[PDB]
Amino acid sequence: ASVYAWNRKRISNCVADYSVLYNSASFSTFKCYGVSPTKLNDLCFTNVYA
Amino acid sequence: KSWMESEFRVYSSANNCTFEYVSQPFLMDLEGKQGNFKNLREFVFKNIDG
Ligand SMILES: *[C@@H]1O[C@H](CO)[C@@H](O)[C@H](O)[C@H]1NC(C)=O
């Protein structure tokens, strides 16, 4: 999608796979402004948007 | 010479729906027997801590 109409997905009730997104050597940079990228599998959330 | 389910009016306004769950599709008896019953159902519902 584009910035004028961005699609949002509701991914719920599933075990995440942050280990793949952590070490992938495909994206440019992580540099994400929330919580620490390390040990992301320890914390647990209710819902995550896409 | 069979019974078919046609009316599905259980829901009318299909708004933004949250996480849904499905099961394996199957086919029940779908026939009207007379006389005496043969079994009973029991479903205890409870909402504690979500
Ligand atoms: C649908 O969207 C409205 C407007 O954002 C919101 O108030 C409502 O909670 C949503 N319904 C859901 C998430 O089931």
Curated annotation (Swiss-Prot), chain A:
Mutation effect (L21I): In strain: Omicron/XBB.1.5, Omicron/EG.5.1
Known outcome of mutating T29A: In strain: Omicron/BA.2, Omicron/BA.2.12.1, Omicron/BA.4, Omicron/BA.5, Omicron/BQ.1.1, Omicron/XBB.1.5, Omicron/EG.5.1
Subunit-level organization: Binds to host ACE2. RBD also interacts with the N-linked glycan on 'Asn-90' of ACE2. Cleavage of S generates a polybasic C-terminal sequence on S1 that binds to host Neuropilin-1 (NRP1) and Neuropilin-2 (NRP2) receptors. Interacts with host integrin alpha-5/beta-1 (ITGA5:ITGB1) and with ACE2 in complex with integrin alpha-5/beta-1 (ITGA5:ITGB1). May interact via cytoplasmic c-terminus with M protein. May interact (via N-terminus) with host bilirubin and biliverdin, thereby preventing antibody binding to the SARS-CoV-2 spike NTD via an allosteric mechanism.
Known role: Attaches the virion to the cell membrane by interacting with host receptor, initiating the infection. The major receptor is host ACE2. When S2/S2' has been cleaved, binding to the receptor triggers direct fusion at the cell membrane. When S2/S2' has not been cleaved, binding to the receptor results in internalization of the virus by endocytosis using host TFRC and GRM2 and leading to fusion of the virion membrane with the host endosomal membrane. Alternatively, may use NRP1/NRP2 and integrin as entry receptors.
Protein name (Swiss-Prot/TrEMBL): Spike protein S1
Gene for this chain: S
